[PDB]
Amino acid sequence: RGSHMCDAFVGTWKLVSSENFDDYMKEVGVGFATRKVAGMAKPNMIISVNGDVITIKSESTFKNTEISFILGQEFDEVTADDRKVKSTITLDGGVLVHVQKWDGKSTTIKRKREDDKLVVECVMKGVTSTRVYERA
Ligand SMILES: COc1ccc(S(=O)(=O)Nc2cc(C(=O)O)ccc2F)c2ccccc12
Numbered sequence: 001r002g003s004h005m006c007d008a009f010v011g012t013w014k015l016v017s018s019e020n021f022d023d024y025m026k027e028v029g030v031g032f033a034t035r036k037v038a039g040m041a042k043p044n045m046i047i048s049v050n051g052d053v054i055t056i057k058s059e060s061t062f063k064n065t066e067i068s069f070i071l072g073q074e075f076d077e078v079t080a081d082d083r084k085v086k087s088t089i090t091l092d093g094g095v096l097v098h099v100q101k102w103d104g105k106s107t108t109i110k111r112k113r114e115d116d117k118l119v120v121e122c123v124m125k126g127v128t129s130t131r132v133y134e135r136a
Pocket of ligand 1: 028062081120131
């Protein structure tokens with residue numbers, strides 16, 4: 001197989017900034033103790049592409065997680081904060097758009113490349129958070 005545009009995401013990334021994530025987590029419904037421990041974490045994110053399958057791994061002192069998915073195809077995800085969600089990830093103009101659905105709720109996480117960074121923007125009921133990763 002040849003190159004794909006989404007190979008721009010591939011690599012090893014480290015969190016360098018996080019803005020408003022506590023208020024986002026409150027809107028998502030994350031409990032106090034999990035918010036405090038999860039907000040401290042400075043994860044590494046490892047993204048790989050193999051054929052049609054994209055794999056996103058996160059490693060941190062809080063939790064290790066791994067999702068593998070095909071664009072546009074719904075999957076089951078257990079999130080780092082222990083929600084059991086239905087997830088669908090698509091590519092819209094270079095941006096990975098990830099919708100998580102659970103318990104009648106929904107949140108959207110966008111991942112995009114900007115300069116040498118990977119920018120993660122999430123939104124829940126009007127509350128947004130921005131988390132920025134750099135190459136590790
Ligand atoms: C480290 O505590 C977490 C790790 C991951 C998730 S999430 O469900 O994967 N969504 C997500 C991930 C990122 C990221 O990886 O930076 C940025 C914004 C997000 F909404 C969490 C979701 C809720 C609370 C804590 C989470």
